[PDB]
């Protein structure tokens, strides 16, 4: 997150960290056993046994007392996800139940976010050509932008497909960046998934998200 | 290294990998107990006891049979190094001797490079906004560029100070990138240290190095 701020310890209890190999991205706890992230995080299709989910975390890949480490039973990419255009860029993670069938233990630092002043958070690059991830979870306030402004020839043109949305400033500055993929956009309810963007904080190039309200039926059907 | 190629296993035995905390950059073995790198790698001045030097390596931060791990006795930034302009951007690492006073064991994969068709190597970003380092050591062929072309108003203007040099293409493409700082430029003799660049592989923006021949007396004086 470029142009953002360090979030408080109990500010985003719904954010999730995903690890496999040397790869990382974020997510959103929408239910005790369900994490919603981007489809392009898992488009190389790693094994579910290679995936690690950490809930309750503030520093990236640092152990904490409220941190909760979980395994992934399975994940479901959207059936119509396009790796070329990043349309339908959302996936669902199913967490591994313990002996007594409790996936995530709810706490002041671990809590699911509801489904449908917007705020974006992640551990991505704090500068456009940053060498490392953000150690602390960063947060930023980004306004929702209209679809007519999204599909303007000077902003994004025809790249904006149904299911997408804009958030940020047409003047640049504050935006999402590399490493923030799959992270939440909360306006609290989950209103977006950090999906793609041409640059980090460029003028007339705000970040593009996944419209969570556009896929409410898909999430309800595939989280049962 | 953007636009580069995977180097062979015994192609650059003089390259060194430096680790401290979550920070990394490259270097050049110029002597059995001396590694030459960039001054801006160590401008935050970490302790020498926090520095790890790995010689003989092909995959970044991966153990190998020819790999040699060494401690750093001390390092010497250039006394006139400017963090504002990156002039005199070079530093010298002194390796830790063992019981019998042998710092680095020479092998087919560990060998110092001599001091004064140019080639640049490193584990940096393979794309401009890359999320991770290069796993394999990349190499690239970059031509030496004239100082008049360096100081052209359309290329770099007045940013080119004495002790600097250019290497790469005015058309873009192949160049050094983020994560390659301190790495070698060999034309073999060491002719440059990867120092700074405005973008990765931009048109009329080739990478800037440290002219090793400009600081030969300094290196000879401070490696005795």
């Amino acid at each position: 997150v470029v142009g953002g701020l360090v979030a408080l310890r109990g500010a985003h209890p719904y954010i999730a960290a995903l690890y496999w190999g040397h790869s990382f991205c974020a997510g959103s706890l929408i239910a005790p056993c369900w994490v919603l992230t981007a489809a392009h995080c898992l488009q190389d299709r790693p094994a579910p046994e290679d995936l690690t989910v950490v809930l309750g975390q503030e520093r990236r890949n640092h152990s904490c007392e409220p941190c909760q480490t979980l395994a992934v039973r399975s994940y479901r990419l959207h059936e119509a996800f396009s790796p070329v255009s990043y349309q339908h860029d959302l996936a669902l993670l199913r967490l591994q139940e313990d002996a007594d069938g409790s996936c995530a233990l709810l706490s002041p630092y671990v809590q699911p976010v509801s489904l449908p002043l917007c705020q974006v958070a992640g551990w991505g690059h704090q500068f456009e050509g940053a060498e490392e991830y953000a150690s602390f979870l960063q947060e930023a306030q980004v306004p929702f932008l209209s679809l007519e402004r999204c599909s303007a020839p000077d902003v994004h043109g025809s790249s904006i497909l149904p299911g997408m949305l804009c958030a940020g400033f047409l003047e640049g500055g504050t935006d999402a960046c590399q490493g923030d993929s799959g992270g939440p956009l909360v306006c609290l309810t989950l209103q977006g998934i950090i999906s793609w963007g041409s640059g980090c904080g460029d003028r007339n190039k705000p970040g593009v998200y996944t419209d969570v309200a556009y896929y409410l039926a898909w999430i309800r059907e595939h989280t049962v | 290294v953007v636009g580069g190629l995977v180097a062979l296993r015994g192609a650059h035995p003089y390259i060194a990998a430096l680790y401290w905390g979550h920070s990394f950059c490259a270097g050049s073995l110029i002597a059995p107990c001396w590694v030459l790198t960039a001054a801006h790698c160590l401008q935050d001045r970490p302790a020498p006891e926090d520095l790890t030097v790995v010689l003989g390596q092909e995959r970044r931060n991966h153990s190998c049979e020819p790999c040699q791990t060494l401690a750093v006795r001390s390092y010497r930034l250039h006394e006139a190094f400017s963090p504002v302009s990156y002039q005199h951007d070079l530093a010298l690492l002194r390796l830790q001797e063992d019981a019998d006073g042998s710092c680095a064991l020479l092998s087919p994969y560990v060998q110092p490079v001599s001091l004064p068709l140019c080639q640049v190597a490193g584990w940096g970003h393979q794309f401009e906004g890359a999320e991770e380092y290069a796993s394999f050591l990349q190499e690239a062929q970059v031509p030496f560029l004239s100082l008049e072309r360096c100081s052209a108003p359309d290329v770099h203007g007045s940013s080119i100070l004495p002790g600097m040099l250019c290497a790469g293409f005015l058309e873009g493409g192949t160049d050094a990138c983020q994560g390659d700082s301190g790495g070698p430029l060999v034309c073999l003799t060491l002719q440059g240290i990867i120092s700074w660049g405005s973008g990765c592989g931009d048109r009329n923006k080739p990478g800037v190095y440290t002219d090793v021949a400009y600081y030969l007396a300094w290196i000879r004086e401070h490696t005795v």
Partner: antibody, heavy 128, light 108 residues
């Protein structure tokens, strides 16, 4: 960056043939490799692709079940095993690469899912 | 999937001609459009990607635009070296790159 095709020639109908595409100057691991055929006097026709994200291997319906595309990343070469070659499989077969999309950022420097580099082409004739 | 292109087009040097591609909601209206030029006896050459972007080395006089299920390519400042085959390209629902019929551009 160079792509070189080989293996073309005159084949009887119902025969078999294998094509090869040697790659040089770029990493034969970060790109999608494709076969595109140019029948004489017609247009382009996409045949096969390998290492396409969310897929393993994609075939055109006209060649499905008869053509097999595979890689030898160590040899930096691409194969196309053509079986049951019928009459309208005559074409100039091309080998091309496309860069897949990776993460959040799209850059003007990198040409995603576009066939930027092609090969010279190898001629396959299926006649009796 | 299939993409519809005019069989041929004509122009005078210095003029401006337009090559149009028509598709459906599964290839063009749902994804990017690409343009390739093929001189006789040579491999195709990438002209346009992402519906409006040019690879380095392609003149600024080549312009591409996309509007829903239709895409077009414009060549302004037409020269005698533009006599070639022009193809639109896309990927369908199962990826599987798709090519248009091709247009014969003639420079008269």
């Amino acid at each position: 960056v160079q792509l070189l095709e080989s293996g073309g020639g005159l084949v009887q109908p119902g025969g078999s043939l294998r094509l090869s595409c040697a790659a040089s100057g770029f990493t034969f691991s970060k790109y999608i490799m494709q076969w595109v055929r140019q029948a004489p006097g017609k247009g382009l026709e996409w045949v096969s692709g390998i290492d396409i994200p969310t897929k393993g291997t994609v075939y055109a319906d006209s060649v499905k079940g008869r053509f097999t595309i595979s890689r030898d990343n160590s040899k930096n070469t691409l194969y196309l095993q053509m079986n049951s070659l019928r009459a309208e499989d005559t074409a100039v077969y091309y080998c091309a690469r496309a860069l897949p999309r990776s993460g959040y950022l799209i850059s003007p420097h990198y040409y995603y899912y576009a066939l930027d580099v092609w090969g010279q082409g190898t001629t396959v004739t299926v006649s009796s | 999937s299939v993409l519809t292109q005019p069989p041929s087009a004509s122009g005078t040097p210095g003029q401006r001609v337009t090559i149009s591609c028509s598709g459906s909601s599964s290839n063009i209206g749902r994804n990017y459009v690409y343009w390739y030029q093929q001189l006789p006896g040579t491999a195709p050459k990438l002209l346009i990607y992402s519906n409006n972007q040019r690879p380095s080395g392609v003149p600024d006089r080549f312009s591409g635009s996309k509007s829903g299920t239709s895409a077009s390519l414009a060549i302004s400042g037409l020269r005698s070296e533009d006599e070639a085959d022009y193809y639109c390209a896309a990927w369908d629902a199962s990826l599987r790159g798709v090519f248009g019929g091709g247009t014969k551009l003639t420079v008269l």
